[PDB]
Amino acid sequence: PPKQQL
Amino acid sequence: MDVPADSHIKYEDAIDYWTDVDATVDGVLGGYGEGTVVPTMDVLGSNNFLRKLKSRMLPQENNVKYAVDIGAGIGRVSKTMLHKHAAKIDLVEPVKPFIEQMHVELAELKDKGQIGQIYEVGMQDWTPDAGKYWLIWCQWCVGHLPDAELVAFLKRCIVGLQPNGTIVVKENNTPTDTDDFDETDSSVTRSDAKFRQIFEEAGLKLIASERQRGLPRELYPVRMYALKPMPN
Numbered sequence: 306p307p308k309q310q311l
Numbered sequence: 312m313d314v315p316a317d318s319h320i321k322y323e324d325a326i327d328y329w330t331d332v333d334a335t336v337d338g339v340l341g342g343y344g345e346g347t348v349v350p351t352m353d354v355l356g357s358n359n360f361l362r363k364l365k366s367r368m369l370p371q372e373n374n375v376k377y378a379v380d381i382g383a384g385i386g387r388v389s390k391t392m393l394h395k396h397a398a399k400i401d402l403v404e405p406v407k408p409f410i411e412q413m414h415v416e417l418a419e420l421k422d423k424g425q426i427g428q429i430y431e432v433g434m435q436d437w438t439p440d441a442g443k444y445w446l447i448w449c450q451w452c453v454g455h456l457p458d459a460e461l462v463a464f465l466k467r468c469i470v471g472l473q474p475n476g477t478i479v480v481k482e483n484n485t486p487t488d489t490d491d492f493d494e495t496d497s498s499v500t501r502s503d504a505k506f507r508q509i510f511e512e513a514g515l516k517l518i519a520s521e522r523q524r525g526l527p528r529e530l531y532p533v534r535m536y537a538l539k540p541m542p543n
């Protein structure tokens with residue numbers, strides 16, 4: 306899925 | 312150096328996670344559902360990508376445009392995008408409640424007979440019939456396989472292509488050349504360099520690489536890769 310960049 | 316990011320993948324952890332996720336657009340998009348710009352941008356970008364690739368995707372040997380939606384979730388990509396381009400669609404998805412909801416999501420397409428087979432399996436255990444597919448579309452799912460297994464999957468996919476068939480991978484990238492393991496869903500986010508290594512090892516050549524525009528700034532970059540088998 307789309308995910309927040311760490 | 313740290314052990315490889317993909318050494319931490321555990322298939323059972325991934326399936327346990329996804330089986331408890333809501334069978335909805337919000338669920339399969341990790342919260343970035345219809346209240347956000349993401350579904351709209353995603354379909355716009357995928358349609359534009361396929362439109363610009365039309366000259367690279369003419370069927371050969373009397374084929375029609377049979378596609379497969381890999382890691383399909385509830386069928387969102389087929390319902391909202393692939394059905395326009397494809398003559399017929401198969402789907403591969405391991406999670407049982409997602410398959411159940413997929414039958415609802417795809418009802419109108421099923422009424423037209425446009426859905427062929429739904430394979431309730433992980434992609435690592437799935438083999439396309441030889442020569443069947445004009446397009447193998449892999450979106451937001453290949454991080455569930457470690458590198459070697461993904462190479463193996465892509466090699467099976469090549470045999471599953473029609474003459475002049477195409478593989479598309481639409482996936483996140485890390486911002487640097489280091490892959491990130493996500494313990495929540497037991498998957499890796501890969502660098503562009505890692506994807507290119509994997510594609511080469513699988514015997515594929517890139518014919519396009521395009522960034523998905525317009526996504527919320529906090530997200531990892533998302534890239535669309537179009538791939539052909541290397542000539543013998």
Ligand SMILES: Nc1ncnc2c1ncn2[C@@H]1O[C@H](CSCC[C@H](N)C(=O)O)[C@@H](O)[C@H]1O
Nearest residue numbers: 329382383384387406433434450451452455
């Ligand atoms: N080993 C595996 N093989 C194929 N799909 C897998 C997988 N492990 C998890 N998945 C699936 O990958 C999906 C990631 S979310 C993305 C769903 C869909 N491609 C979309 O863009 O709407 C989930 O449906 C999840 O169950």
